[PDB]
Structures are given as C-alpha cells and as structure tokens.
Amino acid sequence: MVVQHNLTAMNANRQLGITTGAQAKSSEKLSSGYKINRAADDAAGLTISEKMRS
Amino acid sequence: MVVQHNLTAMNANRQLGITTGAQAKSSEKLSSGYKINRAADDAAGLTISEKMRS
C-alpha cells in the first residue's frame, strides 16, 4: 500500500460526486414537477415547449 | 402520471363546458317558449318567421 495517496478512496469519492450530481438533477424534477428546468436537460424540448406554451 | 398537468381533468372540464353550453341553449327555449330565440338558432327560420309575423 502507499500511505501517501489513498487512490482506493479518491475513486470512491469521484464516483460519489457523479452520484450526488445525478441525485440533485433528479430531485429538482420532482420538487418542480418539470422534466426540463434548463436547456441543459433537453434543448430541443425547452425550445419546442416554449413554442407550445406560447 | 404527471403531477404538473392533470389532462384527464382538463378534458372533463372542456367536455363539461360543451355540455352546459347545450344545456343553457335548451333551457332558454323552454323558459321563452320559442325554438328560435336568436338568429344563431337558424337564420332562414328567423327570417321566414318575421315575414310570417308580418
């Protein structure tokens, strides 16, 4: 083992970051009840929806 | 189910409107006693009924 860098943990950490990212993306859709809150969800769908809302 | 738009209720609402349109257009004829109350009912029979009243 290397004492100086816990590379077993830094990957568990990076994967935890990807998972807590996907969780805050999901939680927002449930609290707002919109699948598309920003263009980064679905740019054609944000655009198409504003045409249809209008 | 989407929480953010109850489309079965918007349908039942939009059909309830069409139904109580038909109900109020029937009710007017029963209370007044005339089939043609206004020229939207049929304009040939409004026109002919004024020539026959005349």
Automatic annotation (TrEMBL), chains A, B:
It is found in: Secreted; Bacterial flagellum. It comes from the Bacteria. Flagellin is the subunit protein which polymerizes to form the filaments of bacterial flagella. Belongs to the bacterial flagellin family. This is Flagellin. It comes from Roseburia hominis (strain DSM 16839 / JCM 17582 / NCIMB 14029 / A2-183). The chain holds residues 1 to 54 of 270 of the full protein.
